[PDB]
Each structure stands twice: as C-alpha cells, then as structure tokens.
C-alpha cells in the first residue's frame, strides 16, 4: 500500500544486544518509516498501531531474583523526552539450581497519536537472556491507521 | 487527521483495589465518537473493530494458595444487555521475592452501534496500575 509501515526483527548476528534489522524476508520498513539508532522514526503525524515481542530463555535459575522487562517508549522531536507507552515485567525464577531451560515471551501492542519526527524504542533489560537466534521470536512494528 | 473511532484508555493510578479506565491522560485516546460510560467503551457506529487490552499482576511472595488470574474483554449487546466473552486468558501465578504476570488480548470483531466493551480482571489487589503503560484497553474501527 502507501501506508507508513515497519516490522523489524532482531539481528541474529548481534552479540548479547537487541539490534533491530530490516531484512528482505518477511520484514518491512516502508512509506517513509526509517530505522535510525535502533529506533523507528515516524514520517507523518497521525494514529499508529505499535507492537513488539521479545522471548527470553535461561538454562536454569541463578541465586539472585531475575526480573525481565520489555518496553516501547516515545522520544519526542520537540524536547528529546522519553515516555513509556507500553511495558511489562516477568519473574522467570522463584527458586534456584540439573538445569532445565526456561522461556518467557512478552507481547506489547496499542494505538498512539504520534508527531512526525517522534522516535519509538523497543528495549529490554537482560539481552544476555534474549533468544534472538531463531526468527519469529523478537520483532517490533508500527503501521499508520 | 483520521476520523476512525479510536480509544486507548489506561488504569487510574490514584484508584484503589479496582480497575478504573481513564482517557483524560497523555498518551491516551477517546475520540471519533467512542464514549467511556460506566467503566466501559461505547461503540459509536456499526462495523469491524480491532480490540486489545493488557493487564500486569504483581505479588510480594508466591501466593500461600492456588490463585488463578484472568483477564477478559466482554461484549454487552445494545438491547438485552447480554454480556458475551470475546477474548480471555487465565494465568497460574508462581506456585519474599516479587512475582509479575502480564496478560495480552486482541482481535477483530463486528460490533453493532451502542454495543459496550468491558475489560475486567478477578484480583484487583494484585493489579499493578501505579506504573504507566502496564494496564491499557483500546479499540479502533478498521
């Protein structure tokens, strides 16, 4: 169509970091949306649908209490202020210690009135736990409505 | 501009032990005819709507009992006030360190005008509404 759109996927080759990518196969960055500084830049004022998923994986439970967050934040052109739009927290481990693998996905989605030149960041707290190897697990998208 | 009916209402942080949706906030919407009435979103015209809601539950230590958490979006028909489940999940909280359970619901539904939508949970005493963007409820016409 002609609608501003993106669906970016985590770079599988990055190392313990969340790095958004516009790959050819089943990814999108079109109709004026740009990926600058791992951040989607809104090309025009209006309503957008904004969404993201991360999947965290761990081989067992460490001593310290583990808290996982995923967040979509808006950075305003006007001031460079950074407000949380969508977030969630997950408690993967309640005990410690063989070592069985654990998995915790987080999905965020909603509708926001945005200004041209606003940037959106999709950010986590434990990239050492991020399962970005396989595809379809880590992604970040907008589409103008 | 856009003239598509749209809402994105957020849990009142100053409310206490209940889920109260608010629209008169930054990074919230209620426009093109959608009303917030008796804690529920009112559909201003017939058609396809995308409906979504997220809640975050939190406790200071694994419950002493087998708690189940649920989140539901329900359709109340204009007449007959019939309440049907559109979207729902149930989460098992962890079987003192803090625990966190998000639930996300969304999908597309044909609605008649004056149909109401409620987004409701079962344990408001575990609902984490103090923080921004953890608890929301929206629709948009497609």
């Amino acid at each position, epitope marked *: 169509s002609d609608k501003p759109v993106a669906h970016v996927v985590a770079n599988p080759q990055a190392e313990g970091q969340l790095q958004w990518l516009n790959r050819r196969a089943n990814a999108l960055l079109a109709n004026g949306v740009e990926l600058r500084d791992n951040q989607l830049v809104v090309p025009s004022e209006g309503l957008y649908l904004i969404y993201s998923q991360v999947l965290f994986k761990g081989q067992g439970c460490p001593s310290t209490h583990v808290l996982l*967050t995923h*967040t979509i934040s808006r950075i305003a052109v006007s001031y*460079q*202020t*950074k407000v949380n739009l969508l977030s969630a927290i997950k408690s993967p481990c309640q005990r410690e210690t063989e070592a069985k693998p654990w998995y915790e996905p987080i999905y965020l989605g909603g509708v926001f009135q945005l200004e041209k030149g606003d940037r959106l960041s999709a950010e986590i707290n434990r990239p050492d736990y991020l399962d970005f190897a396989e595809s379809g697990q880590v992604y970040f998208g907008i589409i103008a409505l | 501009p856009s003239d598509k009916p749209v809402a994105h209402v957020v849990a009142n942080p100053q409310a206490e032990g209940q889920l109260q949706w608010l629209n008169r906030r930054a990074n919230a919407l209620l426009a093109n005819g959608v009303e917030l009435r008796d804690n529920q979103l009112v559909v201003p015209s017939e058609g396809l709507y995308l409906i979504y809601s997220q809640v975050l539950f939190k406790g200071q230590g694994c419950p002493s009992t087998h708690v189940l958490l649920t989140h539901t979006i329900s359709r109340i028909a204009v007449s007959y006030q019939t309440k049907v489940n559109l979207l729902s999940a149930i989460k098992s909280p962890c079987q003192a360190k803090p625990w966190y359970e998000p639930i996300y619901l969304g999908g597309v539904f044909q609605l008649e005008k004056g149909d109401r939508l409620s987004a409701e949970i079962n344990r408001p005493d575990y609902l984490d509404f103090a923080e*921004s963007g953890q608890v929301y409820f929206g629709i948009i016409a497609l």
Partner: nanobody
Amino acid sequence: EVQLVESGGGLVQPGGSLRLSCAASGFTFSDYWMYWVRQAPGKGLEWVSEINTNGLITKYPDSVKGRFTISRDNAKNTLYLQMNSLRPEDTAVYYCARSPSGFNRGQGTLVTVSS
C-alpha cells in the same frame, strides 16, 4: 511548573563515594525516562546515566561504567546517582533531566574531586 532540584554535591578525595539526589515535581515522574548529565568547566554537557520508568533498564557511557549506578523511587518522586571509585576527571556540576541534552535540569549540584 516542572522543577528538578539536585543535591548531595560536595568535596571528596579520589577513590571516594558520593550519592546525588534529585527531587522531581510538576510532571508524572513514573511516565518519563530520567537522566543524569554533568558539565565540567570548559567542557560540553555530557550524559552519564539513563534509567527507564521501572528502573530495570539502565545505560551508561564507558567514561563512568563500573563506577556509577543510577536508581529511582517513583513513590518518592526522587532520582539517585551512587558514584564510586570517584576520579579527578569526574569533578563537575551534575544535573538530573528528562533528556540527555539536560532538559528541565536545575541549579545542578557541584561535585569536586581533589587531594
């Protein structure tokens, strides 16, 4: 009516420790990512810490990494910077801000590190 008031600034010796404090008011503290920035004499403004709304995401430039810890209390509308293994290269006016360019910073607080 946004106001950020920094405090905890003072004179400390190298290898020393300081806790800076920041009182927020006039905005919803819980909504905004917060920042520590500093300015040494004859130097540009330099961001030293970024923290998200829940305090689980922290970022630091390599200049202060290992040594500085940013934290927040949303109930207290207060932001903190725990500064450890302090160096003479850390002496400056330290501000809290809603951007890394120093947006809505206050009088700042002065941290002097000498013998």
